[PDB]
């Protein structure tokens, strides 16, 4: 789902 894409970046950027 596209709405979750911004969440991946949030995770990967945070870690």
């Amino acid at each position: 789902n596209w709405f979750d894409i911004t969440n991946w970046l949030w995770y990967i950027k945070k870690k």
Partner: antibody
Framework: EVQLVQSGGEVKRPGSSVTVSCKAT????????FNWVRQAPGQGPEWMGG????????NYGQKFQGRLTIRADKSTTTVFLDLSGLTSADTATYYC?????????????????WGQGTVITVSS | VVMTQSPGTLSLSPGERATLSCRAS???????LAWYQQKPGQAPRLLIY???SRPTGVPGRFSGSGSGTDFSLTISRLEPEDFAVYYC?????????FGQGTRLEIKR
């Protein structure tokens, strides 16, 4: 303040193309999803599409595919909406909405911040 | 996925308890359900996200519940400014859809 300032109202003729802007100021832009949601007179909101400005990852509604173009300008923090082949069924108010940030800015997907709206009257 | 809100118009008294229903044509993945409030002439305001979570600024009288295909918004005490149109929006898939809306008006 996280503000979304859209362009002014416009009267377009049937078949033409319109561009609506969305200046996002005071918050994260690239890694957060913006969305365009329109609302006809007397009806409810209808999600049209979205974009992630970081890598310009767009997501268009199946109804509006082939006729919709959402763009992002990271240098000026602006989101755009290109809608071609306008008809009477496209006369509505177009809102640009950014999602919300939670604990550590977790993208909540749901639309928290909205613009003032752009009134598009598709009539000759 | 087709969202269907219920009822069409909810006529209640100020201070009473309000419950609005949202029914999806298929299961919503991950509880991706949101409740928005809209007053005439304004952009909608996010009241509930992720089924039950509440954004900062929304008063505690609004609470979300449900799972699968049935969801419900609950206003424990209807204030004067709580009467408006309410829209439930799903966003578990790549194609988000809204509901037709529920008109929460004052009974008299």
């Amino acid at each position: 303040e996280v503000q979304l300032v859209q362009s002014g109202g416009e009267v377009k003729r049937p078949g033409s193309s319109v561009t609506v802007s969305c200046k996002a100021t005071g918050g994260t832009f690239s890694t957060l999803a913006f969305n365009w949601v329109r609302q006809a007179p007397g009806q409810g909101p209808e999600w049209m599409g979205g974009i992630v400005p970081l890598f310009s990852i767009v997501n268009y509604g199946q109804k509006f595919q082939g006729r919709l173009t959402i763009r992002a300008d990271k240098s000026t923090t602006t989101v755009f909406l290109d809608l071609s082949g306008l008809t009477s069924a496209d006369t509505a108010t177009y809102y640009c909405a950014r999602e919300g940030e939670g604990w550590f800015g977790k993208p909540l997907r749901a639309f928290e911040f909205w613009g003032q709206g752009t009134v598009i009257t598709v009539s000759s | 996925v087709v969202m269907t809100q219920s009822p069409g118009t909810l006529s209640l008294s100020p201070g009473e308890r309000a419950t609005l229903s949202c029914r999806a044509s298929q299961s919503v993945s991950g509880g991706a359900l949101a409740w928005y409030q809209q007053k005439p002439g304004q952009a909608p305001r996010l009241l509930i996200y992720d089924t039950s979570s509440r954004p900062t600024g929304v008063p505690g009288r609004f609470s979300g519940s449900g799972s699968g295909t049935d969801f419900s918004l609950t206003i424990s005490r209807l204030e004067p400014e709580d009467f408006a149109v309410y829209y439930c929006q799903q966003y578990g898939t790549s194609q988000s859809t809204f509901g037709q809306g529920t008109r929460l008006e004052i009974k008299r």
